[PDB]
Scaffold this active site. Structure first.
Site, PDB file in Angstrom:
ATOM      1  CD  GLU A 278      -5.236  -4.634  -4.097  1.00 54.55           C
ATOM      2  OE1 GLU A 278      -5.465  -3.961  -3.071  1.00 54.55           O
ATOM      3  OE2 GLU A 278      -4.136  -5.156  -4.328  1.00 54.55           O
TER       4      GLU A 278
ATOM      5  CG  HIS B 185      -5.456  -2.703  -0.120  1.00 58.15           C
ATOM      6  ND1 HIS B 185      -4.417  -2.740  -1.021  1.00 58.15           N
ATOM      7  CD2 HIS B 185      -5.189  -1.674   0.722  1.00 58.15           C
ATOM      8  CE1 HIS B 185      -3.537  -1.802  -0.715  1.00 58.15           C
ATOM      9  NE2 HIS B 185      -3.993  -1.127   0.325  1.00 58.15           N
TER      10      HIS B 185
ATOM     11  CB  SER C  11      -0.959  -0.033   1.187  1.00 58.74           C
ATOM     12  OG  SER C  11      -2.160   0.666   0.897  1.00 58.74           O
TER      13      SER C  11
END
Length: 566
Positions: free
Chosen positions: A347, A467, A214
């Site tokens: 995600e 994610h 990230s």
């Protein structure tokens, strides 16, 4: 976050402290560093492995007082032996569980781990940069425990860096020496420390791998873009992000004043008076108010964070981003090191919590104008050219006559991760020596083992690979537990740390020693490829064309008339 999860977290926090104590040993050791000797301690894991642990090694002066908002300075060396048998605080931030501010401005530390302090051969060094939107995160072992990686013969280093406004305030006036990106400059200094000191811990200073997920991926990318770090490492891994992502930078120079006014500043909008207020404010106060800084317009235009990496308005001694990241890719030294990049298979599932609090967000997909890349869209997103572009997104993600929450989340996968990856790959190929880039797709779904992010994203009982779901198979965290060795989860830990270690070692993520890879022929991406190939990682490992390619090309169509901006 619920009272329920707060209590459960508190209980896990207490159990973590007892387990940390229990897994501590009496075997202290001393290592050399440029700045003086450091004492670490051997620790245990729930899998009955052990590692040496050095925490709280400073790589910069505590950025307090007059150093607030400023580029990091080198730390003061010490006589004697510095205690590194305990972790330091994290950067000042809102704890996402309790909702209260925690951490300390005194945060510029790194931790070093290895299973063997005197290896007979020098080991690959892996450097992890945590994510968290540049506003949360830490290198504490209750979130990023090295317990899995130390089954491998590597040295693993986990860094901290300044978050939020304290890390990313930016002011136009050159006189004040607050250009921005203090937090990225923190990372730069930490990489410099690692290069000059990893050898003291059994590391190979000439084989360094930086990776992050990230904002940590965007961070790793920046460390590959900036001139400040040229030659400081040798492989890069970008997990679910890069510096071309729309959330990965923001022109925030006009937001300092707004922060000051939320925090009680009285006076005019000029940088000097604004800085003088901000530097006297309580750090907790500034961080708790950061959430309110963005305007309604900015939020509508999908600006995610008020302060983050920025183009610096003037160039000083420690400048890291002198121009837009897209331009920086054109001469980036890091284009010429082996690189791996990837995302998870769903995600956008990460925005479940947001969509639950604001269901009217799904309505945005009726035209999709709000998701048109900001550089192409008009201010009000009412222009016919913006409606046109929005329609192209809409056709990619709306499956029915009315948009669904699932359509929204799928759209988010592309807006926030897959499309920027595509843009970077193509932009990069026009400026590379030909060093390989490998792609993975993390597609392993389990709830038998999870990490704290699942709590934040309200992901409990939610199927699909969100994610941050991959973090679970790389790092120990206080919600983890010992898994049976033949479990699908344990095998995924072995595969993921195995692939990362193999890549770190050779610049090639394939090895036949990794179970499940026996039929894998993992090629890099080539400039001449019209379709991306990726190693899909699920219960089986399989090379497949990237499933997301079709939607990726549909997003690229928005630039048909504006190819110079792609």
């Amino acid at each position: 976050v619920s009272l329920m999860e707060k209590l459960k977290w508190k209980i896990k926090c207490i159990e973590n402290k007892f387990l940390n104590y229990r897994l501590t040993t009496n075997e202290t050791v001393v290592a050399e560093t440029e700045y003086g000797k450091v004492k670490g301690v051997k620790r245990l894991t729930v899998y009955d492995d052990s590692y040496y642990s050095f925490e709280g090694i400073p790589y910069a002066q505590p950025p307090v007082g007059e150093l607030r908002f400023k580029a990091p300075q080198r730390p003061t060396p010490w006589a004697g032996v510095r205690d590194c048998c305990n972790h330091k605080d994290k950067s000042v931030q809102v704890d996402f569980i309790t909702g209260k501010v925690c951490g300390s401005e005194d945060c510029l530390y790194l931790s070093v781990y290895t299973n063997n302090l005197n290896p007979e051969t020098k080991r690959p060094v892996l450097v992890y940069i945590h994510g968290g939107g540049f506003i949360i995160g830490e290198n504490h072992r209750d979130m990023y425990g090295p317990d899995y990686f130390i089954k491998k013969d590597v040295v693993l280093i986990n860094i901290q860096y300044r978050l939020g406004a304290l890390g990313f305030l930016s002011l136009n006036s050159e006189d004040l020496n607050v250009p921005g990106n203090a937090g990225l400059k923190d990372q730069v200094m930490a990489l410099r420390w690692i290069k000059n000191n990893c050898a003291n811990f059994g590391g190979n200073p000439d084989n360094i791998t930086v990776f992050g997920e990230s904002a940590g991926a965007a961070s790793t990318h920046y460390m590959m873009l900036t001139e400040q770090t040229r030659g400081l490492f040798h492989r890069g891994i970008l997990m679910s992000g890069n510096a071309i992502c729309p959330w990965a930078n923001t022109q925030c120079q006009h937001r300092a004043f707004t922060l000051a006014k939320l925090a009680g500043y009285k006076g005019e909008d000029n940088d000097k008076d604004v800085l003088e207020f901000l530097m006297k404010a309580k750090p907790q106060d500034l961080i708790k108010l950061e959430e309110k800084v963005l305007t309604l317009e900015e939020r509508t235009n999908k600006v995610m964070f008020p302060f983050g990496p920025t183009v610096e308005p003037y160039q000083t001694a420690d400048c890291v981003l002198p121009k837009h990241p897209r331009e920086m890719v054109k001469t980036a030294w890091g284009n010429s090191i082996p690189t791996m990049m990837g995302n998870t298979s769903y995600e956008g599932l990460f925005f479940t919590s947001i969509l639950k609090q604001m269901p009217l967000l799904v309505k945005e997909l009726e035209t999709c104008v709000n998701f048109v890349p900001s550089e192409l869209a008009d201010a009000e997103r009412t222009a016919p050219e913006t409606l046109e572009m929005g329609a192209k997104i809409k056709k990619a993600h709306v499956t029915g006559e009315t948009p669904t929450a699932d359509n929204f989340m799928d759209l988010c996968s592309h807006f926030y991760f897959w499309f920027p990856m595509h843009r970077l790959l193509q932009l990069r190929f026009n400026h590379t020596s030909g060093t390989p880039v490998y792609l993975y797709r993390f597609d392993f779904d389990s709830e038998d083992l999870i990490n704290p992010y699942r709590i934040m994203r309200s992901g409990r009982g939610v199927k699909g690979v969100s994610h941050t779901d991959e973090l679970t198979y790389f790092f120990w965290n206080q919600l983890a537990k010992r898994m049976p060795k033949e479990s699908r989860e344990y095998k995924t830990i072995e595969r993921m740390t195995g692939i990362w270690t193999q890549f770190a070692t050779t610049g090639n993520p394939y090895s036949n020693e990794i179970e499940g890879m026996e039929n894998v022929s993992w090629d890099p991406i080539e400039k001449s490829d019209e379709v991306y190939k990726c190693l899909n990682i699920s219960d089986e490992l399989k090379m497949i064309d990237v499933p997301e390619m079709g939607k990726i090309k549909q997003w690229e169509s928005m630039f048909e008339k504006h190819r110079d901006l792609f």
